[PDB]
Symmetry: D3
Subunit: 226 residues, 6 copies
């Protein structure tokens, strides 16, 4: 495809989607066997390997709705991918959420215009695939993680001049801020495929230090995949 | 409160919220013991009774975001209600969804302006309480119902001149159209209380005949309450 | 129709539209002869009777744009109604307006999205039928009422977190807040029929105690109907 | 003021507001006695004279919301004007409205952003002063004119690439298109003064030849002023 | 055309566009030879004459996007004009910009809705013709003027209740406020013709006294025309 | 900073900003001497070296407004960068623009919400620094390139379901589509620093094969930097 140099069939139907391509490399090296790297266009590493008998891929997305939308469109429409799990980080926007918690996004709020342009006059609420969500939740629960299922903010701006609206969203239960989920969930819905975002809380708004938790999370994402 | 003539303490902390006050009456008479009617202002019947040892209320909301918002604000802020489950009907906007299916709303899209006014520039995705959602899902699964967990449209207009956008939402996985969930979920989040919407599919967009299914659904809503 | 169980011909061409179905009952019992109740679906009472030799109906609408829009669409499109007068209450948003004043709405402002969706990019100003407005104004003047003709706010939210914009609207002459007029006026215009809203001021923003005034108002609404 | 070179006291409290400054000149010469020209800044002629014993002014506004807003702000805030009647032309957007009809605007729709910026999230419906409206209506009725009271469109664009929305507005009863009323009515309301627009229909969307009608209209505007 | 009474061929292909028709008269009398006045409709003077061997016109536009849009549409579509240079005034919204500076607008911000209606969901940035811009810049530089090339605000409201957003725009480098450029640049782009705005700073937001500078500016606009 | 691991002082005040970090590597290796790599966080390579006696940096930005906004905020606010030139690719949206043309963006249109959130109610037109623009234009002209100065679209979506609005923008002179310029220009303006985007046309909407042109373009960007 335009941004992925893989041959047809090289990408598995189940794929993990970290924002950082170096985390894709880490995931492939740490968890997968029989690995090949199918993409290095723009340095946006993608790999396919085997986890517990199943082929599974891992593809960096870059940061932000526009970047992830490119990769997700291509994965679905050019490579036939069916199950897409973002494995990311996020910033807590409530005191109740703690660093190293795992958040599974039911849905996402956004300051992006992407859905307003598609559905003029409407507020589109991008939703997770419930079956994947339940699998990941059950796996995280059995792994002994602190798992929170709820709402997140998909932000276009990392550096915002006023945080008043982010604080207000936190007062309405929005758990954390990240930069991809709206796009993943919307595009998966458009194409009738299955998506989920599983996030580790890295700080509060108001790698090695989270690597054990981060691995445990990758494990539940892989499981909800296989 | 302005629209509810109940004395303090007369409304239970767990409440079912049908749109039709005559369905509130039906639910109270059919399922509850030790019943009293605490409201008849505007004919918007509300009752409190006992179900399997637990006090539980049932309150008509009327139709539309503005109507349900009045009752939900008053229930939460004047009567201390903590768990609110809408028990409603909806119109399917996909062929895969069938009449008499039970839909549990994860989230809701809307053509209402209510959240745009609260969060200028943002798309707020109103989300269910996951713990209530899981309880209801598990109860419906064990009851042997066809339960679908997903996205719905909360519409301000029942009679729309063009259905193009409703069809488009259906193409993005939105299951059905109804007229309350955005408001319930948003206000419950605002006030830190727990909400869910459990809906029976009554037709396709494109009482007695659903009374057995409707009862089974009330049963799972009551259970997810007690 | 979907929400009205009347047979064809049972609803008169002129109809009064209180928000409260119990007020429809009061109006029918107090003012009309040869009365029959043609609807009890959702408890949303509707009656037809005779006032000074003319058949006239009275139909509760419920609260909010979405609720009244359902009934008004059905009345116009399924029952051939031609003259629709809302008889309601409102909350004053200026000191000059006094409790028990009668307001006849020329037009209405709104925080609803209903017209933005119909007329993207435009501000639609929903207007009263002038002939009905003049009749009601003249009747109220001759009855010796305090009648104010002007602008109102049709609100989706009764409970607003900030009243800054409501106060600002009051500074621009908007008289009172209510929850139906935009929809009535817009739909009547769409279908080429005649609408008016006549409101009693029940309080300030910043039944029996208004029953004499309320009756006098019903009287002018009936007159502007016959 | 910035755009009007009049001394304090030179402008009467009642003023007619044609869009064309040459029509201001015509009105002054044709109807007024004891006339002086108080402004020629930007050629935007303004005059004060006497009509039936009363001082009255007439001021060109130019075309469009931004132009009239300049003059109306200055007239109200710098010159203490209290009654402002636009006397203009318009283009019919319905077959029922005929050339040479006089339209008295109750309210106005718009494609301008001026009110969206003032009242974010709301649709502001700019309304006529009812007392002036009634006076003008009664005067036109007694003069034997075809007078229509209703809704108009205040357009920012005279030349629109698609007329679909203008046609749709006509289907919702909007009578004609012009380019000033929203601003006049909104600013008069802001400042607690009295405004009206009285328009002659000059063509259909889909001077001498209207001069008799145009005079008769000026006459009713002057009367509703004195 | 509707607002210009010129015969075909009477308007030159290059035209200067002051907002004030009396400035059009001044420009024609001061700079042009062999002059004729081709328009006095609505007092909106237009002239054609000869400058250094070339026919060139000058046409008042009035104030605001709607007014200039009328004239520019007619000039382009009815009279075949190809090069349009607004010669105007503006109010500085930064301390760095000084009275009597000449601003050449690269682009313009706006509070008008005109482009939102044309391009729903998008922010259209109206741009100058670079070739005209460079010519004018080089001419102003050689004339020894203080020339600033940058961004301006095209405002619908001259009198704004809060200046917070205007100040904020100044903090983002917007140089000055005026009332026409968005429309000129957008319409010229629509029709594939060449536009520029050249403005003299007349004051700060927070004729004779600028007549020497104003002439020098007209001179560079004429030059960028011939 | 959060996304750049450079020490203070390691990044030069003038910086080139390709979207592709592998192009940053190419630029550093091909054009610069005394090179060091100061960043590999997220694989988003950044280098500093020397070009014709001047220190200059080159930093990948990733794709889309949100990604470039992160890097540009950090470069300006944490590293004191003063001159920022994006060196990118774009897709032509007019037949007149040809593959391998160099476009220098005066301004940018967008479907992003980033500026609507910052300037509610306004259309912000993000503008290039004119001095940098002129330098680059003059350098490209002297190099013998086909240089076009004009408007571009900064898109959030690479894959759009309908191209109607993109085609319409092309009809209004917008030259090409890319995914960063609005953010670069807006943030540079916010912070009072100097930005430009210089783009090679890589295809039409409706590496080695452009490497000679691409180098020549890098050369003019470097020059407009030194
Ligand atoms: O506090 C945060 N705000 C925004 N995005 C965050 C935050 N924490 C983690 N991410 C995630 O990391 C990248 C940005 O650094 C984005 O991919 C975003 O999803
Ligand atoms: O097809 C439908 N469209 C809209 N609302 C519906 C539909 N089916 C059921 N409801 C529900 O019933 C009431 C309206 O009749 C509303 O309360 C809505 O939630
Ligand atoms: O102060 C008020 N705010 C909003 N609606 C009001 C107010 N006063 C009367 N109504 C009217 O009564 C119902 C809501 O209680 C709505 O039908 C509304 O039109
Ligand atoms: O058909 C029309 N469209 C728009 N404005 C009109 C029309 N007819 C009359 N006017 C009025 O005349 C000026 C514009 O020529 C404007 O002042 C407008 O109010
Ligand atoms: O400070 C200003 N604000 C708005 N417009 C201005 C300013 N200074 C000059 N103009 C220009 O003069 C007319 C309005 O008086 C408008 O044509 C506008 O472009
Ligand atoms: O046709 C195009 N559409 C959108 N972006 C493009 C196009 N051509 C080049 N780019 C540029 O390359 C990346 C996306 O592939 C983005 O950085 C964008 O600026």
């Amino acid at each position: 495809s335009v941004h992925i140099e893989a041959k047809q069939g090289e990408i598995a139907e189940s794929i993990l989607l970290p924002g950082d391509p170096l985390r894709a490399k880490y995931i492939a090296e740490t968890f997968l066997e029989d690995v090949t790297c199918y993409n290095n266009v723009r340095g946006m590493l993608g790999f396919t390997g085997t986890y517990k008998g199943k082929r599974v891929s891992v593809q960096g997305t870059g940061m932000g709705v526009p970047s992830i939308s490119i990769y997700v469109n291509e994965l679905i429409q050019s490579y036939g991918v069916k199950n897409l799990i973002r494995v990311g980080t996020c910033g807590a926007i409530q005191k109740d959420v703690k660093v190293r918690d795992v958040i599974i996004a039911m849905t996402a709020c956004t300051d992006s215009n992407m859905n307003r342009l598609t559905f003029p006059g409407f507020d589109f609420a991008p939703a997770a695939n419930f079956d994947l969500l339940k699998k990941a939740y059950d796996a995280g629960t059995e792994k002994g993680l602190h798992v929170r299922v709820g709402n997140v903010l998909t932000a276009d701006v990392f550096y915002r001049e006023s945080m008043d609206m982010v604080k207000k969203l936190g007062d309405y239960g929005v758990l954390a801020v990240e930069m991809e989920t709206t796009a993943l969930y919307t595009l998966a819905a458009k194409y009738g495929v299955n998506a989920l975002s599983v996030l580790t809380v890295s700080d509060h708004i108001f790698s090695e230090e989270r690597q054990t938790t981060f691995n445990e999370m990758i494990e539940i994402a892989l499981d909800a995949a296989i």
